[PDB]
C-alpha cells in the first residue's frame, strides 16, 4: 500500500466555489455571462493554488508554470464542470456552481447554446464510460499539461518529463484493476479519446469569450481583472495558432 500519487490528487482537489449570482432576479444575457466571468476569476485562483500543489509542477520554470495555467484554465474548468454535472444532476444540467446551474432555458439565454450542449455531451461520457473518481482526477491533472506553444516552453525538457510521468500514472490506475492486457489497452484507448474530445470544446469557448470581451461594453458585460488580461493576451495566441493542444490520436 503506497498510492502516493493518488493520495495527493485527492488531497489537493479544490472545494466548492460559488459565483455569487442573483438567482432571485429574472435571467438576462448580461447578468448570466458576468456571473460566469466572476466564477472564472474565482476558479482561476483555486486552480493556481491547485496546480502549484501538484507533484513535480514546481520543477517547471517560473514562467512556464504561469504559461500552462494561462493556456489550459479553460479546459481544466470545463472537465471539472462536466464531472460535477454528472455526479450531481446526472448530466441533466450544467452544474457550473451551486448558485449557477444552467438549464435548457439558460443555455439559450447565454447565447452559447451549441457550446453548452457539447459540454453536456462530455458530461454524459462520464456515465457511458463508467469513469471512476480516481480516473477523473488523473485525467484532469493531465489536462494541465495538454497545451503548449508550438515553439515550446522555456524549459520544454522538464515539461515532457512531467507529462510522461502523469501519463504513466494513468496506466497504473487502469492496470491496478484489470487483469488481462485486452482490458487495459482498450481502457487506455477510451480514456485518451475522452481527453482529446475536450480540446475541441475548449477552443469553441476560447473564441466565444474573446469576441465577447471585444463587445463587452456593447452588451454590458463585466470582465474581472485577470479575466480581461488573460483573454486579450494569452487566449489570442491559441486562436492564432501560436499555442496548440496535445492530442493523443489524430
Ligand X SMILES: C[C@]12CCC(=O)C[C@@H]1CC[C@@H]1[C@@H]2CC[C@]2(C)[C@@H](O)CC[C@@H]12
Chain residues binding ligand X by CB under 6 A are 33, 36-37, 39-40, 43, 74, 77-78, 81, 96, 205, 208-209, 212
Among ligand NK, ligand X, none, residue 81 binds (CB under 5-8 Å by kind): ligand X
CA 208/CA 167 separation, integer angstroms: 31
Burial class (CB in 10 A: 0-12, 13-18, 19+), 228: middle
Site string for ligand NK, 81-120 (x = CB under 6 A): ----------------------------------------
Between 78 and 162, whose beta carbon lies closer to ligand X? 78
Instruction: Give the residue with the Cβ less far from ligand NK, 3 or 149.
Output: 149
Output the smallest distance, CB 40 to ligand X, in A: 3
| Cβ 1 vs Cβ 78: under 8 Å | no
Q: Interface with ligand NK includes 63 (CB under 6 A)?
A: yes
Binding mask 135-174 for ligand NK (x = CB under 6 A): --------------x-xxxx--------------------
Cα distance between residue 82 and residue 140, in whole Å: 11
**Shortest Cβ 132–ligand NK spacing (Å):** 33
Copy the grid coordinates of residue 4: 502516493
Query: For residues 155-168, b (16+ Cβ closer than 10 Å) or e, as one string?
Result: eeeebeebbeebee
Q: By C-alpha distance, which of 247, 223, 243 is closest to 67?
A: 243
Q: Which does 39 bind (CB under 5 to 8 A by kind): ligand NK, ligand X, none?
A: ligand X
Cell (9 digits) for 175: 492496470
**Helix, strand counts (H, E) of the chain:** 11, 4
Q: Closest approach of Cβ 235 to ligand X, in Å?
A: 9
Residues 104, 113: Cα–Cα separation, whole Å:
8
* Closest distance of CB 60 from ligand X, Å: 23
Which residues of this chain interact with ligand NK, rule CB under 6 A? 63-64, 67, 149, 151-154
Amino acid at each position: 500500500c503506497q498510492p502516493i500519487f493518488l493520495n495527493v490528487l485527492e488531497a489537493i482537489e479544490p472545494g466548492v466555489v460559488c459565483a455569487g449570482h442573483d438567482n432571485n432576479q429574472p435571467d438576462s444575457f448580461a447578468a448570466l455571462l458576468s456571473s460566469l466571468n466572476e466564477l472564472g476569476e474565482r476558479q482561476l485562483v483555486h486552480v493556481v493554488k491547485w496546480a502549484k500543489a501538484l507533484p513535480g509542477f514546481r520543477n517547471l520554470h517560473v514562467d512556464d508554470q504561469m504559461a500552462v495555467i494561462q493556456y489550459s484554465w479553460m479546459g481544466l474548468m470545463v472537465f471539472a464542470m462536466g464531472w460535477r454535472s454528472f455526479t450531481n444532476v446526472n448530466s441533466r444540467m450544467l452544474y457550473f456552481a451551486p448558485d449557477l446551474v444552467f438549464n435548457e432555458y439558460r443555455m439559450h439565454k447565454s447565447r452559447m447554446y451549441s457550446q453548452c450542449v457539447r459540454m453536456r455531451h462530455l458530461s454524459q461520457e462520464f456515465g457511458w464510460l463508467q469513469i471512476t473518481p480516481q480516473e477523473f482526477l488523473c485525467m484532469k491533472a493531465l489536462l494541465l499539461f495538454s497545451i503548449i506553444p508550438v515553439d515550446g516552453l522555456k524549459n520544454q525538457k522538464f515539461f515532457d518529463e512531467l507529462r510522461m510521468n502523469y501519463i504513466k500514472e494513468l496506466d497504473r490506475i487502469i492496470a491496478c484493476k484489470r487483469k488481462n492486457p485486452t482490458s487495459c489497452s482498450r481502457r487506455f484507448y477510451q480514456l485518451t479519446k475522452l481527453l482529446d474530445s475536450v480540446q475541441p470544446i475548449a477552443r469553441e469557448l476560447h473564441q466565444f469569450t474573446f469576441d465577447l470581451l471585444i463587445k463587452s461594453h456593447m452588451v454590458s458585460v463585466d470582465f474581472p481583472e485577470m479575466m480581461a488580461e488573460i483573454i486579450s493576451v494569452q487566449v489570442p495566441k491559441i486562436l492564432s495558432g501560436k499555442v496548440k493542444p496535445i492530442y493523443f490520436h489524430t
